[PDB]
Chain A
Amino acid sequence: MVHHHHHHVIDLLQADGNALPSAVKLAYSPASKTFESYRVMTQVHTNADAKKVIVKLADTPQATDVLNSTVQMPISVSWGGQVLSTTAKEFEAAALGYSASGVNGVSSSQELVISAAPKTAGTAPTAGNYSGVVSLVMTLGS
């Protein structure tokens, strides 16, 4: 109909259609020397021409410990089969995907795998609290 000037939106949801949570805990288990991954599939709700969506995070995320900042344990975050760096990662729609809805922006059905990492490979774990946050940033590109 009558514009309706602007045409670009982004909303990231679980593929359930449900929301992501504020906080997330990985179950702490040895599992023959491994750490389980908080997989979650995703939706990305966007109008057509969505596809040029970029994803970079605010800072390299940390298990954060005030009293002891001594040792930090790495965190690796995968989206669309790609790691997520503080460096902007150009994405295409990554929905797989393409459908049309003049009433709706059609989803982008795949998984974010936050897979926390160790400083050296094949590593025996330290003991502590490890608190923290992960900022995640969605935008468009120039």
Chain B
Amino acid sequence: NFMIYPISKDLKNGNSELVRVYSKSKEIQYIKIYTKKIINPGTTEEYEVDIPNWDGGLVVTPQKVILPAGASKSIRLTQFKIPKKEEVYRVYFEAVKPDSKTIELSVNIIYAALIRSLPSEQNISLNISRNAKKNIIIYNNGNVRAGVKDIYFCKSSNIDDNCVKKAYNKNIYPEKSFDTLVNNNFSYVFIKLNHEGIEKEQGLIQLKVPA
């Protein structure tokens, strides 16, 4: 029984970050930590798979902690290599029972942290495309995921309030493509991405290709 902070992390330039683990328990716990890599993320083809600790892109020190009652610990996470493009991982935190100080079906809650292994120069580049069935397709040409908040299928070239604001809220990861589920005859499209602090807002528009 414990809690971790935080549950999502970005890692750039080879610098480590820490995930902290806090016990809510009166009994001493034993915690093991393991990393899975996320393949074809953002897609319907997204799955997880176990990787090793130093050659898979993530360095996790340590992977086993004795966590005394009410104690807290730090786990270090750093990238092995700096990738050419964004890779994404999940780091699991699990109470292992050597012992943790009808029947019993003990409940083991597990937390996993989403880790973004980021490239040196974050570059965002989007492509436009038309499907078979001529749905409109967005492709990620950049080395970093593209968080799409809202897409503007403008009738005109410019953003009149007649255009159809369709919300997608989806991350399009590099080398991958995304279906707008729109085949209609829009002239130009406008895409809105996410920001809060520091990382620099931009806005972008891409011409439709005909059906």
On A, residues with C-beta under 8 Å from B are 3, 6-12, 19-26, 28, 58, 61, 63, 75, 129-142
A139 near B109 with CB under 8 A, answer no
How many contacting A-B pairs (Cβ < 8 A)? 103
With A22-B1, A25-B102 given, is the CB distance from A139 to B7 under 8 Å? yes
Please give the distance in Å from B117's CB to the nearest CB on chain A: 13
Residues of B159-211 at the interface with A, using a CB-CB cut-off of 8 Å, are: 171, 173, 197
**Which of the listed residues B3, B107, B111, B197 has the most CB atoms from chain A within 10 Å of its own CB?**
B107
User: A23–B104 Cα gap in the complex (Å)?
Assistant: 6
Asked if A142 and B173 sit within 8 Å, CB to CB, the answer is yes
- A-contacting 9-mer, from B38-46, B56-64, B122-130, B149-157: B38-46
Interchain CB contact under 8 A, B46 and A23 = no
Which B residue sits closest to A137, measured CB to CB?
A: B110
Among all A-B residue pairs, the 10 with the closest Cβ atoms: A23-B104, A6-B6, A142-B41, A23-B106, A132-B105, A139-B112, A8-B8, A137-B110, A135-B108, A130-B103
A133/B105 contact (C-beta < 8 A), A6-B9, A8-B7, A10-B111 known: yes
Q: B105 touches which one: A19, A20, A23, A140 (CB < 8 A)? A: A23
Categorize the interface residue count of chain B.
20 to 34
List the interface of chain B (C-beta within 8 A of A). 1, 3, 5-9, 24, 38, 41-42, 46, 88, 90, 92, 94, 100, 102-114, 145, 171, 173, 197
Taking a contact as CB atoms under 8 Å apart, the answer to whether B3 and A131 are in contact is: no
Q: Taking chain A's interface residues, is the majority helix, strand, or loop, or is none over half, making it mixed?
A: loop
Output the residue of B38, B94, B100, B102 with the most chain A CB within 10 A.
Answer: B102
A63 touches B103 (CB 8 A): yes
Q: Does the CB pair A133–B106 fall under 8 Å?
A: yes
Residues of A within 8 A of B38 (CB): 142
Partner of A22, one of B6, B94, B106: B106
